[PDB]
Amino acid sequence: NREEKILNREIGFAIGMPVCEFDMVKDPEVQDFRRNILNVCKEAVDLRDLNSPHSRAMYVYPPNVESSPELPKHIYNKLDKGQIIVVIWVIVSPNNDKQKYTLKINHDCVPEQVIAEAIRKKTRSMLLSSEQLKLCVLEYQGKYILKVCGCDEYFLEKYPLSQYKYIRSCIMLGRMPNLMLMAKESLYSQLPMDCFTMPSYSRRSTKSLWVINSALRIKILCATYKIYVRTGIYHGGEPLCDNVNTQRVPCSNPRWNEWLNYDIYIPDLPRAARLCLSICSVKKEEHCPLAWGNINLFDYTDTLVSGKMALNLWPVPHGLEDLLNPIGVTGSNPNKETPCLELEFDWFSSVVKFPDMSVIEEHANWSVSRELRENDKEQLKAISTRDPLSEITEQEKDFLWSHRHYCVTIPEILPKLLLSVKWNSRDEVAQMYCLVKDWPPIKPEQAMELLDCNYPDPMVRGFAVRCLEKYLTDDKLSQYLIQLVQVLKYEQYLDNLLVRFLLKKALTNQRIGHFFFWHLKSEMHNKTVSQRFGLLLESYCRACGMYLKHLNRQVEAMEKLINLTDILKQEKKDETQKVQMKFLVEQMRRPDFMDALQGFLSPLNPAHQLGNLRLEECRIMSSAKRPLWLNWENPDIMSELLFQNNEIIFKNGDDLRQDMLTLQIIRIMENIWQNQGLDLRMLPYGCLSIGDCVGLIEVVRNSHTIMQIQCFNSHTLHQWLKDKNKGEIYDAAIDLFTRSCAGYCVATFILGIGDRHNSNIMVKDDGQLFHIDFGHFLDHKVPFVLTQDFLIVISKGAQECTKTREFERFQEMCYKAYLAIRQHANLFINLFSMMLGSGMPELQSFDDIAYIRKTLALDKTEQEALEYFMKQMNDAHHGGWTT
Amino acid sequence: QEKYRLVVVGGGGVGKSALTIQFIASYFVTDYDPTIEDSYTKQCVIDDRAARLDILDTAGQEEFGAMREQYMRTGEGFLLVFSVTDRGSFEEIYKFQRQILRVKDRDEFPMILIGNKADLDHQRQVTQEEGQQLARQLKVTYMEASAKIRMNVDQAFHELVRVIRKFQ
Ligand SMILES: Nc1nc2c(ncn2[C@@H]2O[C@H](COP(=O)(O)OP(=O)(O)NP(=O)(O)O)[C@@H](O)[C@H]2O)c(=O)[nH]1
Ligand SMILES: CC(C)n1ncnc1-c1cn2c(n1)-c1ccc(O[C@@H](C)C(N)=O)cc1OCC2
Ligand SMILES: [Mg+2]
């Protein structure tokens, strides 16, 4: 127990709360979670230690690669005859001397082949005696590795060189892939053998539900702290029976003693059956809720609830419509000071347990034992192509249910079929279980739709997880990690398949595990998810290995930035000339604060090392909440080839959760375009929300806003691109200005970002256009207006007529990009529905995500949706986008 | 310490690669590996002080000519080398001498005209008198060399670092 006294200390630092707050939890599910989840840790640490040196190095440095080795046609054409010019750097002298070795090689070469070519660049025709074969053949064996110059990424896996994002990005940008050569011992000697240290708490009638044959009856006894109680049985968001409420008793008399008789049959309660409670006040009609609570009818051991229970209710949000809140948390309030409603459930004089699959498939026979034309099958295909928010009429409900045995031909209609099942029927829930058991596999992006709030059934969610661990790559997983972490709240239990999946994968890929921690620590300021994420972060830190040491340095570093911004906002802040640069430079030069920001991995990117500070550029911005513009050094020995000033914006006041979702969709929109031929270079800079409202923003060097470029006012934007890109580079910089503009214009119209002005739009000296500060999206209370300065640059240099051949092709880029996103409308809408539980201001109800359906014209055909965009573009730009 | 980025420019197959590795590895090579851009470093004390010689073996395939405009901005010492057995390289040396002065916008710059493959006298097409002819024309110093016998290999790079100090 002496080693556990040391590990438990640093674990509580990263979580933000001591570990003892979980050992004193009387909940049996909490203790069983911490006990059984260690099986996921044991299976993970034993997977990281199969091979002695490489398995640990592969974990800490996973190959950041693309999802498919197949290169797009226009990306392959960027290569010289299908070959890439890579630069191999080798250190020879012990005094840190550099020697480059350029070589042309095929793009689809494994790292072992480029190493062997660098061997030829070091030998040529050298010395070899007939006893010196294995002396030099050992060079061609497993002896050397490869590393990106400037970053901490390693080419450890035998994937093609094009798959790696760094090499892939060098092909896009047209840059030299500089790779430093190392040996296996140079990297393996920095990773110890962490033996699995299990904690101290890792020690070693009952009839079925379908034999009860009674009516569900729940009694409310009393309460603490004219009103009544709204009680409802729900399965996610759909109700099973009519909302049964109690008598309207007066205030200050929290007594009822009424067995609420529900219309649901006890053997018909699904596995994910939930009870929804709320208190409404009566003062025409006067009905307004105040407090609400949610309890699942079955606990984590598949047993029916029985006996008395004390439920602590939750405060209603800012905007709640219905009296009862079905989208609850399935838990009691741990505030111990809010109104506590007491209940009493039915007894049955036995432990009623939900039946296993054996009885479910056995009773599935009793449903059939108790007693195809082509024009019909084409309609089911037209239903799967509709967005997940398209209202399925009742006539379409029975169409999919009467043809449930045919839907195996089109497995993409499964999310549509699940909404066509009366889950309040013990016969339909048994037949649907057998269909999901043998359902064909679907795409990982389509399986995520079955993990949101609309599909709370464990058999449905278990299918989606089995479609991820068999078809979801680590690239798309790190891409969709924010939405996958977000849907953990929709799980009604602590230990489940989705948690065991995201834990084992995060414990086997440290690049995934890094963002797996910060996306969970950023939710600790909310107690409704603190217990679930606290137990999950405890299990992660218990077996995350050596990275716990580096992870605690980032927490201490980030915490040293939150308090300073609080002292600069709550205190002082009176004068912004010397006071803005007095206390600011005094804390950054303080000894105890300097070492807090020295030699720790960047939270925005674990491969970036934030080394020495450069206080000469560190300042406080004059924007909202006065962010902190910070600057670091790159302690990499090859820092000359990559960036040298790691610049990060620390936004304290404003919430940075709206930016992450926008900066992520822009990356997803860019990948969809690059995979179809649209070379619209988007700039999705890094952004990570921390804690309550603080967060980090990745800064791009040599970037200036539209207002930053001026010399009175004039159209000097075209001159700035002329002055910085002379010769034949001007023709390429103007093209970069048009392709990035068409992307950042057709994307903001689909998102609906706030009114973009000259400070929202920034341009680089290279000529790339990109937007920033996505604080308001999907808003309604157009954003990218084609100003005069844009057409002066887009339409060559025509100072008068802007509608020329250059602008004529600008519309065609937007049309191909608009229709491309429309073809993937189901993917983006699913990404917004998985973020509804994040409590974002513009992501509260489905009326906001429906704004995507209208801006994409998902109710019209392909050509009719094209004229919609041309109409709205010609309306925003008065006479700009004529037919 | 003593920054000296030496650059070896010239045509194809004139001996830039054989002369470069002869200065460090001190072994003559016989393969024809078309160089693109390789870097070599060697600490020398033959000069009156120390020297951090950063040697760059450049390409001569004319397909990497876009890389010429790069190392001609960072290097402070060049070696216009050609093969006495190849008049094609001899009549293309001045093109390298014009691009260097055009990039830096200077009247002169430390560079030494090297005539390689001098051991192949039975196949020499550019005699010695034509070598010093281009020396006075380009206002540089002429020096024949031969990587096969290691003739004036150290003197070629050492006389280059002597013009850098006498430049100023
Ligand atoms: N006889 C002889 N051969 C030489 C001499 N120097 C170079 N060579 C030969 O010339 C050939 C090509 O020259 P190399 O060493 O590749 O020099 P380079 O000018 O850098 N070649 P490239 O520009 O094509 O990369 C090789 O066969 C090499 O052995 C020399 O002094 N004497
Ligand atoms: C308002 C703001 C703090 N903000 N809010 C939410 N996101 C941002 C945000 C996002 N970026 C930026 N700011 C940004 C700013 C300035 C900048 O260069 C400076 C030198 C300049 N004055 O030209 C480079 C930048 O590039 C990264 C992208
Ligand atoms: Mg060469």
DSSP string, A114-140: HHHHHHHHHHSS----TT-HHHHHGGG
Distance CA A808, CA A812 (A): 7
A625: left (phi over 0), alpha (psi -120 to 50) or beta: left
Distance CA A845, CA A853 (A): 14
SS3 A103: strand
Residues of A in contact with B41 (CB under 8 A): 92-93, 97-99
Look up residue A420 and give its amino acid: S
Let me know the angle formed at the C-alpha of A36 by A31 and A40, rounded to the nearest 5 degrees: 135
Backbone torsions φ then ψ of A217, nearest 5 degrees: -135, 115
Integer CA distances (angstroms), A753 to A54, A404, A686, A760, A873, in order:
46, 41, 18, 11, 15
CA torsion, points A604, A608, A610, A614, in degrees to nearest 10?
Answer: -100
Q: Which domains does chain B have, with CATH numbers?
A: 3-165 (3.40.50.300)
Q: Confirm if B52 and B3 have CB atoms less than 8 A apart.
A: yes
The one-character DSSP state at A602 is -
B129 touches chain A (CB under 8 A): no
Q: Confirm if A330 and A277 have CB atoms less than 8 A apart.
A: no
Atom number, ligand 1, closest to the C-alpha of residue B57: 20
Resolution in A: 3.1
- DSSP codes joined into one string, A146-194: EEESSS--B--S---GGGBHHHHHHHHHT---EEEEEEHHHHHTT----
Length of chain A equals: 883
Instruction: Copy the structure tokens of residue A839.
Output: 């409590």
The one-character DSSP state at A596 is G
A325: left (phi over 0), alpha (psi -120 to 50) or beta: beta
User: Does the annotation place B119 within a ligand binding site?
Assistant: yes
CA atoms within 13 A on the CB side of A101: 21
Integer CA distances (angstroms), A173 to A170, A387, B69, B108, in order:
5, 35, 20, 36
Distance CA B168, CA B163 (A): 9
Let me know the angle formed at the C-alpha of A502 by A314 and A354, rounded to the nearest 5 degrees: 60
Q: State the distance from the centre of ligand 2 to the C-alpha of A747, rounded, in angstroms.
A: 19
Which single residue is written with the structure tokens 């044959």? A213
A257: left (phi over 0), alpha (psi -120 to 50) or beta: left
β-strand pairing of B3-10 with B52-58: parallel
Instruction: Copy the structure tokens of residue A349.
Output: 């004089």
Number of neighbouring beta carbons within 10 Å of residue A437: 13
Q: Confirm if A497 and A48 have CB atoms less than 8 A apart.
A: no
- Run of H or E residues at A815: helix A805-823
| Residue with CA at minimum distance from ligand 1 atom 8 | B15
Q: Is A545 in the pocket of ligand 2 (CB under 6 A)?
A: no
Q: Where are the alpha helices (DSSP H) in A544-619?
A: 547-569, 579-588, 591-594
β-strand pairing of A687-690 with A703-705: unpaired
Instruction: Copy the structure tokens of residue A702.
Output: 């040599």
CA atoms within 13 A on the CB side of A799: 4
β-strand pairing of B77-83 with B3-10: parallel
User: What end-to-end distance do the CA atoms of chain B give, in Å?
Assistant: 17
Distance CA B146, CA B117 (A): 5
Instruction: Copy the structure tokens of residue A146.
Output: 């490869």
Q: Taking each helix axis as running N to C, give the angle between helix A28-36 and helix A38-45, from 0 to 180 degrees, rounded to the nearest 10.
A: 10
Q: Confirm if A241 and A266 have CB atoms less than 8 A apart.
A: no
User: Does the annotation place B42 within a ligand binding site?
Assistant: no
What's the order of all strands across the beta sheet hosting A307-312?
A: A255-265, A215-223, A340-345, A307-312
The one-character DSSP state at A327 is S
Distance CA A531, CA A524 (A): 9
Query: Percentages helix, strand, coil for chain A, rounded to the nearest 5?
Result: 40, 15, 45
Pocket test for ligand 1, best of B9, B17, B79 (most atoms within 8 A of CB): B17
Identify the experimental approach. X-ray
Surface-to-core class of residue A378, CB atoms within 10 Å of its CB (0-12 exposed, 13-18 middle, 19+ buried): exposed
| Residue with CA at minimum distance from ligand 2 atom 6 | A773
Q: Confirm if A342 and A223 have CB atoms less than 8 A apart.
A: yes
Q: Confirm if A342 and A310 have CB atoms less than 8 A apart.
A: yes
What residues pair up with A279 in beta bridges, in sequence order? Answer: A229, A291
CB contact under 8 A, A102 and B37: yes
Instruction: Copy the structure tokens of residue A641.
Output: 């080839």
Spatial CA neighbour of A25 closest among A489, A518, A497, A538: A538
Q: Confirm if A720 and A792 have CB atoms less than 8 A apart.
A: no
User: What end-to-end distance do the CA atoms of chain A give, in Å?
Assistant: 76
B21 touches chain A (CB under 8 A): yes
β-strand pairing of B141-144 with B111-116: parallel
**Greatest Cα-to-Cα distance within chain A, rounded to the nearest angstrom:** 104
CB contact under 8 A, B39 and A100: yes
Pocket test for ligand 2, best of A626, A697, A701, A759 (most atoms within 8 A of CB): A697
CB contact under 8 A, B41 and A126: no
Surface-to-core class of residue A159, CB atoms within 10 Å of its CB (0-12 exposed, 13-18 middle, 19+ buried): middle
CB contact under 8 A, A121 and B38: yes
CA torsion, points B137, B139, B142, B147, in degrees to nearest 10?
Answer: -100
Q: Confirm if A693 and A654 have CB atoms less than 8 A apart.
A: yes
Look up residue B72 and give its amino acid: M
Distance CA A158, CA A156 (A): 7
A326 CA to centre of own chain? 25
Q: Which domains does chain A have, with CATH numbers?
A: 60-188 (3.10.20.90), 209-345 (2.60.40.150), 703-883 (1.10.1070.11)
Integer CA distances (angstroms), A557 to A13, A204, A779, in order:
12, 39, 35
Integer CA distances (angstroms), B140 to A791, B18, B25, B160, in order:
53, 22, 27, 10
What residues pair up with A315 in beta bridges, in sequence order? Answer: A291
